[PDB]
Chains A and B, each alone.
With several copies, the nearest count.
Chain A
């Protein structure tokens, strides 16, 4: 039978490791998307 919507993703160990590496890379490069105070 057909299903209307994709099931909610399951947080398995591999998914966490994928998330973990992305965070580690961004910190290492020190690139973050954060609000920057305007001048004046």
Chain B
């Protein structure tokens, strides 16, 4: 890997973030990127719940 790294850098001037399978006849997904979105989406959802816990009013916008 290191020799390939040197060759690329002299030309210009992380393969473990991808889950890759083998063609029985290839990159299959993005664990780190997917988990960040899947974890953040529930994180803003949790923030909504803690805000909603002790409220009886709320803004009613009919526009």
Q: Which B-chain residue is minimally distant from A15 (CB atoms)?
A: B32
Count of A interface residues, CB-CB < 8 Å: 6
Number of A-B residue pairs having CB atoms within 8 Å of each other in the complex: 16
Which residues of A have CB within 8 Å of B17? 13, 16
Q: Which secondary structure dominates chain B's binding surface? A: helix
Which residues of A have CB within 8 Å of B32? 11-13, 16
A10 CB–B CB distance under 8 Å? yes
B33 CB–A CB distance under 8 Å? yes
Residues of B whose CB lies within 8 Å of any CB of A are 17, 32-33, 35-36, 39
Residues of A whose CB lies within 8 Å of any CB of B are 10-14, 16
